Structure 1
């Protein structure tokens, strides 16, 4: 059971003007160099870059999505974009290059009226993929607070388990998932201060630094392919190395 015990210094890949956005790469065992970007809290377009030099030179192809996205909690896995359909409790899986979009409903989830999972990034849902599964982090519309995690079946894009962490969303700045462990940041998004073992269904101790900057953190996402954290911090696109104890 490998645990993160510290985070290394960030490497900045690009500075853009936009406060909020995402930048994402493939994590499946698919040596794909493409980068996908969204800008702002909502929209219908994704920018596809062929590789990092393309991103550095603002050379993209615009992809029109079948449904508007909201927030900065998306993920790419197996040539597909997973994202929150704005104004609904629907999550979309949009497969690139063929458009076979699938959807699923999270009936018990907050999704509008600024009752955010992560207020700092105006995000209601955070899709995350890692070594142990495909996950969706969200907050309960039953109590308006508790952070829940759905574990998905990849083939059918359906929810197998709902996992209640019992952690209040008011205490969470953002989060990521690595080796089956949910790591949650403080409200200032400077330290990881809470963790939860998603397979054993139990809290586990975690307290370590993420970063020194308190600039607005829009996106925080683990990639199992290179074991780095990807972030968007007030227009600064960063990569952090991660240190596992095992």
Structure 2
């Protein structure tokens, strides 16, 4: 679980789109929990205002291969498609709010709701590609996180580790990078990494903040994005890959860590 040293070229995901026909924003659980398995996937369709539908699929279904097994109707709409599934629950930001909601998928139950203290929302502290990217939920090898900013932090990235059961903020770190200066961010092995553009063609993983030590540094790892679409990239620690949505396709990026 060392420092990132390389990011691969983006590879189009064809699996879920092939079996289902939907390009959709796809999510997988890095801690699959019975009765779900590694073949289970969830899609948020990105069409419409105040989206509440999450579609659940078994891609090796013995009953209805190709069609959703279940459609969940969330009790609050999504602020953005940047939700995560972790340990059997969907964690999402409620529209027009700084609230994170834990929705248990197999029981359709809200198990926790938490206001992220002081967090900006709805266009106050977006990433550099704009949109409602103020609050970014992330999963890594140690569980669930949230990436945000606050007025007191003057727009610098704040990072909190979340208790997945009750959404308490178990530890917080105020980092030394402005959120609006980077295009997206993700956590790998307890290090926050950010992506920046530095010309019209060229982007890099440009910064690292290690939550274990507090130490940060500039990086220059090439990051080959196809587009500049306001979204959140999500690390999947089970697959050890980054998953991104660009409005056309889901793509994965392979990673290498120093050994």
> Do they superpose with TM above 0.5?
yes
The answer as to 2:252 corresponding to 1:245 is no
| Equivalent residue runs for 1:46-85 within 5 Å | 46-51=54-59, 59-60=67-68, 61-85=70-94
Which of 214, 219, 226 is equivalent to 1:213? Answer: 226
CA distance in 2, matches of 1:136, 1:4: 20
Q: Given the superposition, is the C-alpha separation of residues 58 and 168 from structure 1 closer, same or farther in structure 2, using an over 3 Å criterion?
A: farther
Structure 1 residue 184, shift from structure 2 partner: 0.6
Residue in 1 aligned with 2:169?
159
Q: Which is greater in Rg?
A: 2
Q: Could you list the structure 1 runs, at least 4 aligned residues long, displaced by more than 6 angstroms after superposition.
A: 15-18
Offset at residue 167 of structure 1 (A): 1.1
Q: Structure 2 regions of 5+ residues with no counterpart? A: none
The structure with more strand, counted as a fraction of residues: 1
Counterpart contact for 2:7–2:253, Cα < 8 Å: yes
* Root-mean-square deviation (Å): 2.6
Counterparts of residues 219-230 of structure 1 (less than 5 Å)? 219-230=232-243
How much does 1:9 deviate?
2.2
SS of the residue aligned with 1:23? strand
- TM-score of the two chains, using structure 2 as the length reference: 0.83
> Partners of 2:206 and 2:142 in 1: how far apart?
22
**Offset of residue 244 of structure 1:** 1.1
Deviations 1:118-151 (A, max 9, x none): 2525312111111123210011133551110111
**Equivalenced residues, count:** 241
**1-structure distance, mates of 2:207, 2:74:** 34
Relative contact order (alpha carbons < 8 A, sep ≥ 6): 1 or 2 greater? 1
TM superposition shift of 1:169: 1.4
> Hey, what's the Cα distance between the residues in 2 that align with 1:82 and 1:218?
16
SS of residue matched to 1:170: helix
1:217 and 1:232 in contact (8 A); partners too: no
- The match for 1:128 among 114, 124, 138 is 138
Cα distance in 2 for residues equivalent to 1:210 and 1:150: 25
Superposed, which structure 2 residues align to 1:1-246 within 5 Å?
2-14=2-14, 22-28=25-31, 30=33, 31-40=37-46, 42-51=50-59, 59-60=67-68, 61-101=70-110, 102-112=112-122, 114-120=123-129, 121-187=131-197, 190-216=203-229, 218-246=231-259
> Is the CA contact 2:91–2:100 (under 8 Å) kept in the aligned structure 1?
yes
For the residue of structure 2 that corresponds to 1:69, the secondary structure is coil
8 Å CA contact retained: 1:178, 1:224: yes
Post-superposition shift, 1:111?
Answer: 1.0
